[PDB]
């Protein structure tokens, strides 16, 4: 199972359900209490997250999955004046 994430830029990225389950909100969307359109299933839509940012946090979506049962190294994502600012509200908006 996997889900697709769209950025306000137009880029698209799909992460396995469990891989996307690291968002806390993307997993609830796969079946959220909403109507069902003839199409658009297991997908995510961020009107406030660029493609480079949805992929940045997404890396932790998969890194956290194999690190949830590790507890030994768990490094830290690089942050600088160029990328990370959008993750402020986007990274936090995607639960943990």
């Amino acid at each position: 199972m996997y889900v697709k994430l769209i950025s306000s830029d137009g880029h698209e990225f799909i992460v396995k359900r469990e891989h996307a389950l690291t968002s806390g909100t993307i997993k609830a969307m796969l079946s959220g209490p909403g109507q069902f359109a003839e199409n658009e299933t297991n997908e995510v839509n961020f009107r406030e997250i660029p493609s480079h940012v949805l992929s940045k946090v997404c890396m932790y979506f998969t890194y956290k999955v194999r690190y949830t049962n590790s507890s030994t190294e768990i490094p830290e994502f690089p942050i600088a004046p160029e990328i990370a600012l959008e993750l402020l509200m986007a990274a936090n908006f995607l639960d943990c």
């Binding site: 690291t22 968002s23 806390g24 940045k56 946090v57 890396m59 932790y60 979506f61 890194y63 956290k64 690190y67 949830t68 590790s70 768990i74 830290e76 994502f77 942050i79 600088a80 004046p81 990370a84 600012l85 993750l87 402020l88 986007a90 990274a91 936090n92 995607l94 639960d95 943990c96």
Partner: peptide, 15 residues
């Protein structure tokens, strides 16, 4: 392991 929400605060909190 934490999501990107915590890593993003590292720069805003320190940087």
């Amino acid at each position: 392991v934490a999501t990107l929400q915590h890593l993003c605060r590292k720069t805003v909190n320190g940087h």
